[PDB]
């Protein structure tokens, strides 16, 4: 009720500002978004209104990307908005989820540019471009891999801000092997990529939760897994998985306040890592 009024007010402010700034393509997209938002308000279509909020965010990205000289990011934000508007009348139920992921990775690109992580910012644009290409053309399976890429890109951004530079470098490398494999089509490689991302999630969370020893073991697991991703073995996925299962137990035992079991899982995880390195 009052919230959709807020969203319509915001997008109308964007169009006025875009007109004043000479951003005619952005301004007209905002106007059509405002027109679409009012139609969905009279029809009570909640799902269309949810897409409206996401579209307004990516239009904010486009206006801000232009103000920062990030013209390529601005063009991708506009393409995202155009594709999102067309799909509202098309009737794709997955439109909200697809556009949501694209907007999140576009946010990473803009934020990484402000934080000096140009390498990460460049990678986020490529992920968005492939996601936009997949949606504009009709590629379905790619979007599943896009989700995992955006997750590991989030890890790299947070690790850099948290001072975990070793984790940030690994996350940057992991996404590239995913982006390279996405455009190459190697599906067996992507399975190992998924497990590595879980490993990187553990390392990020363990560092924040006073589990530095656990985090270091997770880094060893991921760094050993990348050397085998470039080796090309399916037994690697099983080997990493057996490490992941017990790395998770130590993390979950700490959350539940069971330090005795946390040490037991930690030592078994270390033993499994040592055998692979041996």
């Amino acid at each position: 009720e009052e919230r959709i009024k807020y969203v319509i007010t915001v997008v109308e402010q964007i169009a006025k500002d875009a007109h004043r700034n000479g951003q005619e393509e952005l301004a007209k997209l905002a106007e059509r978004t405002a027109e679409e938002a009012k139609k969905a308000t009279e029809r009570g279509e909640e799902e269309t209104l949810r897409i409206v909020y996401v579209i307004v965010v990516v239009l904010q990205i486009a206006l801000e990307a232009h103000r920062n000289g990030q013209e390529e990011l601005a063009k991708l934000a506009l393409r995202t908005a155009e594709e999102a508007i067309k799909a509202t009348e098309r009737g794709e139920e997955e439109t909200l989820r697809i556009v949501y992921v694209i907007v999140v990775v576009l946010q990473i690109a803009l934020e990484a540019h402000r934080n000096g992580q140009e390498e990460l910012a460049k990678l986020a644009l490529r992920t968005a471009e492939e996601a936009i290409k997949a949606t504009e053309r009709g590629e379905e399976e790619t979007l599943r891999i896009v989700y995992v890429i955006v997750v590991v890109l989030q890890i790299a951004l947070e690790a850099h801000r948290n001072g975990q530079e070793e984790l940030a470098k690994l996350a940057l490398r992991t996404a590239e092997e995913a982006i390279k494999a996405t455009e190459r089509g190697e599906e067996e490689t992507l399975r190992i990529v998924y497990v590595i991302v879980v490993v990187l999630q553990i390392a990020l969370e363990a560092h924040r939760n006073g589990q530095e020893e656990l985090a270091k073991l997770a880094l060893r697991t991921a760094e050993e897994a990348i050397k085998a991703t470039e080796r090309g073995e399916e037994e690697t996925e099983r080997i990493v998985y057996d490490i992941v299962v017990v790395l998770q137990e130590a993390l979950e035992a700490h959350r539940n306040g069971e330090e005795e079991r946390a040490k037991k899982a930690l030592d078994e995880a270390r033993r499994r890592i040592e055998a692979t390195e041996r």
Binding site: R3, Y6, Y53, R97
Partner: peptide, 14 residues
């Protein structure tokens, strides 16, 4: 893959 999070409410005006 996990479901996408619901959008949090807007912060109040300053």
């Amino acid at each position: 893959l996990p479901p996408l999070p619901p959008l949090p409410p807007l912060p109040p005006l300053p």
